[PDB]
Design a binder for this molecule. Sequence first.
Ligand SMILES: [Ca+2]
Ligand SMILES: [Ca+2]
Length: 207
Amino acid sequence: ETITVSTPIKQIFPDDAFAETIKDNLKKKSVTDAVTQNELNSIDQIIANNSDIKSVQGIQYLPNVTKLFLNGNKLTDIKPLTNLKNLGWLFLDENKIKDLSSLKDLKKLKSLSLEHNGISDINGLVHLPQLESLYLGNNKITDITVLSRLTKLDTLSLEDNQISDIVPLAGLTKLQNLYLSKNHISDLRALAGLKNLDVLELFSQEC
Ligand SMILES: [Ca+2]
Ligand SMILES: [Ca+2]
């Protein structure tokens, strides 16, 4: 939503680490400083990797965010991201996010990163058919059936998981970079129809 009157940053963003992130972004001197919606509208990029953030509550008030770097934090719930319709790049590596339902309406999202999140179920990704780059390395994924729906993918990382069947990737004609090392892959027939692969990693398969 939006704030109708001047309001302290700390009152909008509960998480102290995140409040500090917003403070620096807006070049304000303190999280106790009052901000307006006009100022919040100016935010289109949040760089907060390894910033000890546990909750991004308050981010709902930043309608123009297109890039969000939140790698290495303490995130679990990303429901506050639900209506950030302009989100194009979303990096959430090294967190503990498993509920991907909040991403279902992010129809402009082109790059998504969720490595090291302990994820096993990615069926929620079906709602991001426009996705171009997807990083899911170092998780506990076995079933990648849903990926057959992400036909726009040109970059896909599924390294260090528990995948055996890559048939779901057979129809992803746009794939240029495919990282599949450290899985349980034996059958590579699925790659017979891929014509644009430039980078392909398949080493260290445990069968
Ligand atoms: Ca607080
Ligand atoms: Ca600072």
